[PDB]
Enzyme design. Sequence first.
Site, mmCIF file in Angstrom:
data_model
loop_
_atom_site.group_PDB
_atom_site.id
_atom_site.type_symbol
_atom_site.label_atom_id
_atom_site.label_comp_id
_atom_site.label_asym_id
_atom_site.label_seq_id
_atom_site.Cartn_x
_atom_site.Cartn_y
_atom_site.Cartn_z
ATOM 1 N N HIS A 167 -31.478 -19.142 11.187
ATOM 2 C CA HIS A 167 -32.147 -17.925 10.721
ATOM 3 C C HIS A 167 -32.729 -17.343 12.015
ATOM 4 O O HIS A 167 -33.640 -17.916 12.627
ATOM 5 C CB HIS A 167 -33.236 -18.283 9.706
ATOM 6 C CG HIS A 167 -32.685 -18.797 8.408
ATOM 7 N ND1 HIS A 167 -33.188 -19.906 7.766
ATOM 8 C CD2 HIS A 167 -31.637 -18.378 7.658
ATOM 9 C CE1 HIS A 167 -32.476 -20.152 6.680
ATOM 10 N NE2 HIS A 167 -31.529 -19.238 6.592
ATOM 11 N N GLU A 170 -36.612 -17.076 13.157
ATOM 12 C CA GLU A 170 -37.393 -18.287 13.346
ATOM 13 C C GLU A 170 -37.317 -18.795 14.779
ATOM 14 O O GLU A 170 -36.819 -19.883 15.056
ATOM 15 C CB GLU A 170 -36.908 -19.331 12.347
ATOM 16 C CG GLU A 170 -37.153 -18.872 10.908
ATOM 17 C CD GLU A 170 -36.304 -19.595 9.892
ATOM 18 O OE1 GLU A 170 -35.782 -20.690 10.200
ATOM 19 O OE2 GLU A 170 -36.177 -19.057 8.772
ATOM 20 N N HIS A 260 -35.880 -25.192 11.787
ATOM 21 C CA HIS A 260 -36.264 -23.919 11.176
ATOM 22 C C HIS A 260 -37.748 -23.583 11.328
ATOM 23 O O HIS A 260 -38.522 -24.326 11.927
ATOM 24 C CB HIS A 260 -35.999 -23.966 9.663
ATOM 25 C CG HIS A 260 -34.557 -24.012 9.282
ATOM 26 N ND1 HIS A 260 -33.904 -22.927 8.742
ATOM 27 C CD2 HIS A 260 -33.655 -25.025 9.295
ATOM 28 C CE1 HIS A 260 -32.666 -23.266 8.434
ATOM 29 N NE2 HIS A 260 -32.489 -24.534 8.761
ATOM 30 N N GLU A 335 -39.246 -27.902 9.532
ATOM 31 C CA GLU A 335 -39.827 -26.574 9.373
ATOM 32 C C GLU A 335 -41.172 -26.419 10.069
ATOM 33 O O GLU A 335 -42.114 -27.160 9.779
ATOM 34 C CB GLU A 335 -40.010 -26.263 7.884
ATOM 35 C CG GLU A 335 -38.733 -26.305 7.050
ATOM 36 C CD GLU A 335 -38.029 -24.965 6.968
ATOM 37 O OE1 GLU A 335 -38.552 -23.969 7.517
ATOM 38 O OE2 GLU A 335 -36.949 -24.910 6.349
HETATM 39 ZN ZN LIG Z 1 -34.785 -21.087 8.297
#
Ligand SMILES: [Zn+2]
Length: 375
Positions: A167, A170, A260, A335
Amino acid sequence: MQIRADFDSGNIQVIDASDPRRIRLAIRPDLASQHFQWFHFKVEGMAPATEHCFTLVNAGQSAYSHAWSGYQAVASYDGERWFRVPSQYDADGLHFQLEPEESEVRFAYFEPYSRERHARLVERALGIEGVERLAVGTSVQGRDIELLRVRRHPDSHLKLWVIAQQHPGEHMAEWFMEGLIERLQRPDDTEMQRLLEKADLYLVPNMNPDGAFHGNLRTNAAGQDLNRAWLEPSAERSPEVWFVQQEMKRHGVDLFLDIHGDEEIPHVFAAGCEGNPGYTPRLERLEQRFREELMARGEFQIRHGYPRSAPGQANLALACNFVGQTYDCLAFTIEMPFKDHDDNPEPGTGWSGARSKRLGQDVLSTLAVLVDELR
Ligand SMILES: [Zn+2]
């Protein structure tokens, strides 16, 4: 005063910047998808001793609008030192204020990682003992997707994979990769010596160069969410993922970490494969060991995170789940917060590139501890 975003990862639409007390801006949707949240712009010609008040007028229509509460925008006068600014969220959007010490400043959703810095990271990596550019894929728009391999012993038998920033918004993800790679420069690093005697590292510093360069949040140039493209990848629509999957087939996988950033949760966490039909007792045990060891070393916790998946209900289109089941290996999505890691409050900077780099280094320590248990 002039506002612009005509640079790497820039994203903003200027509505009205004629009044310093009522600067109106809008976030720009992804190249080919409705998603948006990431913003990055520069302001020039600001008057001294003057409070400037900004509003991202369409924050309410962003991809994760609920995540604006508790979020403080990041700013920088030199592009190197980033600091958080007073911010609030309501129906008119996200607001933040600054009485600039300089005539120019830049604002971003997170400390940005430029493609230029990426090239320097790869350059540095290739100068490190045992590091080679094993393969290079090509994005929709022709940019390089380097797959680096760290191999210091011809008799290693494990392949540990770490990919980042599928993504594009990020940016903390590639910062994590910079820290991981830079640690490899250390002489007399006992933990790394142990790890590399048994394993080789397969690294992809940036999985979506087109999205990053263009200031996208969620999709690649074609409008595809790369982390939903693993069950049915396409050499045309999701070449970035097609590439990694081909290389995994060639070399094998014994561990997979997908790096992420999460807009909402103010905590660093990891999501596993508990929903995979192939979620065996062995993998369940290894997931516990990983979390236990990482929690003892880095800024990482196990209380907050995404809702767990019911047995067998995992979405196999996500990288973590797909790779974990396909290769029967320990697999996690790591994350990092766009806000702060609330367990260790540092409001002046919130979560940062520096802290992302450190987590990358702490994850390496964790891998060194688990290497003998992966297979
Ligand atoms: Zn992500």
